[PDB]
Nucleic acid binder design. Structure first.
Ligand SMILES: CCN1C[C@H](C)n2c(c(O)c3c(=O)n(Cc4ccc(F)c(Cl)c4)nc(N4CCN(C)S4(=O)=O)c32)C1=O
Ligand SMILES: CCN1C[C@H](C)n2c(c(O)c3c(=O)n(Cc4ccc(F)c(Cl)c4)nc(N4CCN(C)S4(=O)=O)c32)C1=O
Ligand SMILES: [Mg+2]
Ligand SMILES: [Mg+2]
Ligand SMILES: [Mg+2]
Ligand SMILES: [Mg+2]
Ligand SMILES: [Mg+2]
Ligand SMILES: [Mg+2]
Ligand SMILES: [N+]
Ligand SMILES: [N+]
Ligand SMILES: [Zn+2]
Ligand SMILES: [Zn+2]
Lengths: 368, 184, 368, 184
DNA sequence: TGCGAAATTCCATGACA
DNA sequence: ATTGTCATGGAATTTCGCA
DNA sequence: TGCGAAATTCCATGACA
DNA sequence: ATTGTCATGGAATTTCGCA
């Protein structure tokens, strides 16, 4: 404060204040003669309040805040003091956008067998058809084979009725779903436990995690659309046709239809593949096991130049899910408890709850 | 001649009337010839209409080259014939009073009837709900003749529900005397 | 047809049918022995109907359709016939997504003078404040200087009342706006003509074209949000403060505030810049003219590897603006009349109307 | 001493009462000292409240270092003083009965009054709507003393509305005899 | 005529419904 | 008949203080 | 052992609220 | 306590028919 500034006036040297400039008194204030002009050097005990005033004009970041201060003042290391305040502005931290991208996505291993993992989801509401409004879509992870069920609501009870029909064929080890109300209810947990099926949930608000089924939703709607061109949207009676059509469509990268991956032989549908006509079923199932293990698997893409990756104990902010108008897009800062993998973390949220969360719904808190 | 395959032939038949369950009275039984895999469908009647509604569900999953049945009314109607023609399914009938399948299908149909009888006594009205588990049992039942269950033969894998407890399938002295006092 | 296929059976050579393979009759059908197995060669008069059947199973594209046909058939140049049909499937053309990116954006020259061009827009609805629901935002193109007006509705009459207040200061040559109802009404055209102001409209549903004002909307909301944290959303009384705060905030790339670009001198606001205290106003206005012409201008970015650029007479499809559920995302194909610039075109739309349209709301029609 | 600048000093004053126009009766006149730029605000009264509401609009665009006025009630109230203090504006009063500006401001205020009188006669009630054009006129009027209009001096550019037809500003024999029969 | 650190510039990221 | 923009904060680069 | 063209593979683009 | 995906159609590359 006035201590430091006194020593300075009487020509002594202080660390951080270059000796080559002449420091003087005028109007009761320590001034200095800088290339850019004459600036006031406020005492250290003033600086915080100044930075805050500059920042608060429009809640500006580093450079825009600095440019204001530099108009009137100079002191050693001004930006450090600017950055200090930015890291403490609750309003800036929870309102500003991130400017760092997530690390490159994971490409999880394709489940090894049909019925290892099911991905499920709702589509809807759709226009009413026969009094139905939603579609339950169930996709086998290994095969891509799909089941469709029309429902009146995205409810546990309708999910349960449909899965009882499906599981008549076979019971899966794991069912994967997002955290919609239908799948997180304890009624659904009980239904699953009763059958030895393990529920596995996506991190919240991150439908990429249910990518397998989400991607099939697109095809389902795309085919429904084409079929309904020029007609009223009577989709109910089309679900069976779509199911069959999609389960028997080739994936150009795979060179197989999901039916083929599931049964190792075409049923009596148009353009049925005849290549295994002379094999025994046993020989056929042997070739099938082989096809199933040699399927193309994509790999993790190159990181963007400005990606960030989570580190235990780092301050991070969860994205607000359905933010209201004129309200911050980010929650208050929280702490990375565990790094499950480079794209998934457990955080402690100031309440404090444990939350398993996608990196895509996080930003690193700025300025530490 | 080429080897036998799944979807080569489906064998269908009705079972009933049964005691009502959620207003259902019959079961449409479908068994794939080659694998012995069984699908079951509850119906309100053994009609062409009920058959069509039920098979529409199954044929949205796999379509057989041939359907084989006895000469039941539902299966011999011209409506059912139209339905099969639309789908490129050839229909096959056993001569009247002389039903024929294969050893495998005959044995499977026997189990189905016996397994139903066993679980209906004691709760003759709860069967609608039991259909899913009846099917898993049937399809995860080991075949003496082949070394494999229908599940294994249809999908080329082990099932996540092995029914390693092959059941008696017979009636206990409890179930015998209380089945004779059920329809009495 | 049977003509071509007869010559083939008796060992003669036909163009397109490689001579090294043995062609034979069986079950009343011309067959051939290919590495992949034995395929049927249908007569040319059959092929169209076959491709169509394959395609229609699930309205599949090139490879997935081909893979079906290849199961049973072979003939010369199958994909040409596949592609022929894809280009004629109305349902596929209007439902499928594009897989080609637009060419790189234009960075239009910054207007030379304040009041050359105004960019205007509505924000809202916001939560009611004092019975107001919208904000009219007017941004001067050269300076970025901004005016804010609260309104009850995004209406011509409210736009007119506000612009009458604004234009009291100065009249702009051009006002740029999107095609919202407030700005396209003839009442607004009359209001503009009366004052010698030329209206210039964005291509429809392309707010990038109003980028200048759109970007200021973000800052306006961002500052409003910060200021309202922990309080009810009483934004009405804040508009003046926000206006002033933003007009006096530095752009780090420019090193000027919009007020400075507008007047060449700070008014009596906090941290006012003092650098021209010793210049005369004349000297000041001379330095200002200089600053205004030497401002940083960004340039057009590198094209993506799979961009497309419009060519006169090309078939293209306009994006459907607010597509209903289960309805196609694209209009029927149309023809590029004129290429206004690499990112803007005039199209004739089958009705046929002339429409000036953004390349971003177009895809090139596939398969010609 | 440093040269004069825009926003160094704003000169304010009321004009009225006037004939009602959309329920307004007064005009708050603001003239920047250095440029001669004029802003006008319709008010319902010459009160501190009306002054504050009006200047709040102007000061959301530019803030003066000094406001100068005569000793009108509205300008000498402690409320108006609070308002100015909040904004770091120094208030300046001319001695009572001895109003002083500068040559430029005096001349500008003269034009304003004269230009208003000229356009009110014939339509004494339509003036509220005319304020925008009155201001453009005033601000695009060439200064004999400096070579430039206020617009040019405030913005450093030519205006898109040059008022190249410098008006008479005087009253025609029509306007004289029909202004004497207006308030009569 | 070169060092360590501060200052400035660069620029991907994201949001304007 | 028209056309993206620009605050933001780590990183990269340049400049500064001193010798 | 090399040519022109057909076939196949590659892969950015975009959409799953 | 978890994790993107994959149809699509021009372009790039490889293979094919023939010599
Ligand atoms: C209520 C439980 N829920 C949560 C949210 C509503 N959700 C969802 C669901 O099925 C969803 C989707 O299919 N898509 C479409 C989608 C978008 C991008 C993408 F990459 C992929 Cl693979 C799919 N978006 C969803 N989201 C709206 C925006 N975000 C909020 S979101 O969560 O991302 C979403 C749920 O069931
Ligand atoms: C009714 C007249 N209109 C047309 C549409 C509704 N619009 C609009 C308006 O002001 C808009 C926006 O500010 N933003 C925000 C925005 C989004 C992306 C972007 F890059 C930039 Cl620059 C801004 N989006 C709008 N759009 C919703 C989606 N599209 C339909 S859209 O047209 O792109 C939009 C109108 O006034
Ligand atoms: Mg969902
Ligand atoms: Mg979904
Ligand atoms: Mg029978
Ligand atoms: Mg708009
Ligand atoms: Mg907008
Ligand atoms: Mg007075
Ligand atoms: N994995
Ligand atoms: N331009
Ligand atoms: Zn802040
Ligand atoms: Zn199609």
């Amino acid at each position: 404060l006035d201590a430091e500034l006194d020593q300075l006036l009487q020509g002594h040297y202080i660390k951080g204040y270059p000796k080559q400039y002449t420091y003087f008194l005028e109007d009761g204030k320590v001034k200095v003669s800088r290339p850019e002009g004459v600036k006031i050097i406020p005492p250290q005990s003033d600086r915080q309040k100044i930075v805050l005033q500059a920042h608060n004009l429009a809640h500006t970041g580093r450079e825009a805040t600095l440019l204001k201060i530099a108009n009137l003042y100079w002191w050693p290391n001004m930006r450090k003091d600017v950055v200090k305040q930015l890291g403490r502005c609750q309003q800036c931290l929870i309102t500003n956008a991130s400017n760092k991208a997530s690390g490159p996505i994971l490409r999880p291993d394709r489940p090894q067998k049909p019925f290892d993992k099911f991905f499920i989801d709702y589509i809807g509401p759709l226009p009413p058809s026969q009094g139905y409004l939603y579609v339950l879509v169930v996709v086998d992870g290994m095969t891509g084979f799909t089941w469709l069920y029309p429902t009146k609501a995205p409810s546990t009870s309708a999910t349960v009725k449909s899965l009882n029909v499906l599981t008549s064929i076979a019971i899966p080890k794991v069912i994967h779903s997002d955290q919609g109300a239908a799948f997180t209810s304890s009624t659904f947990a009980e239904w699953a436990k009763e059958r030895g099926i393990h529920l596995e949930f996506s991190t919240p608000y991150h439908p990429q995690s249910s990518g397998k089924v989400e991607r099939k939703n697109s095809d389902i709607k795309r085919l429904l659309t084409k079929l309904l061109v020029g007609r009223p949207t009577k989709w109910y009676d089309l679900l069976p046709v779509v199911q069959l059509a999609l389960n028997n469509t080739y994936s150009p990268v795979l060179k197989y239809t999901p039916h083929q991956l599931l049964f190792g032989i075409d049923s009596n549908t148009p353009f049925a593949n005849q290549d295994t006509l002379d094999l025994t079923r046993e020989e056929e199932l042997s070739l099938l096991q082989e096809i199933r293990t040699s399927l193309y698997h994509p790999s993790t893409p190159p990181a963007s130049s400005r990606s960030w990756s989570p580190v235990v104990g780092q301050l991070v902010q969860e994205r607000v899910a359905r933010p209201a108008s004129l309200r911050p897009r980010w929650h208050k800062p929280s702490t990375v408890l565990k790094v499950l993998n480079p794209r998934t973390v457990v955080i402690l949220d100031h309440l404090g709850n444990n939350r398993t969360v996608s990196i895509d719904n996080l930003k690193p808190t700025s300025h530490q | 001649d080429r080897p036998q395959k799944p979807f080569d032939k489906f064998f269908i038949d009705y079972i009933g009337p049964l005691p009502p369950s959620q207003g259902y009275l019959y079961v449409l039984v479908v068994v794939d010839g080659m694998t012995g895999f069984t699908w079951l469908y509850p119906t309100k009647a053994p009609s062409t209409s009920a058959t069509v509604k039920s098979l529409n569900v199954l044929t949205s999953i796999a379509i057989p080259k041939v359907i084989h049945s006895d000469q039941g009314a539902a299966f011999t109607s011209s409506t059912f014939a139209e339905w099969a023609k639309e789908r490129g399914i050839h229909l096959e009938f056993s001569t009247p009073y002389h039903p024929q399948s294969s050893g495998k299908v005959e044995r499977k149909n026997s189990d189905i009837k016996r397994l139903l009888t066993k679980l209906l006594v004691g709760r003759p009205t709860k069967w609608y709900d039991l259909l899913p588990v009846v099917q898993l049992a049937l399809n995860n039942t080991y075949s003496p003749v082949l070394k494999y269950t229908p599940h294994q033969l249809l999908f080329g894998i082990d099932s996540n529900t092995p029914f390693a407890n092959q059941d008696t399938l017979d009636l206990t002295r409890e179930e015998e005397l209380s089945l004779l006092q059920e329809i009495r």
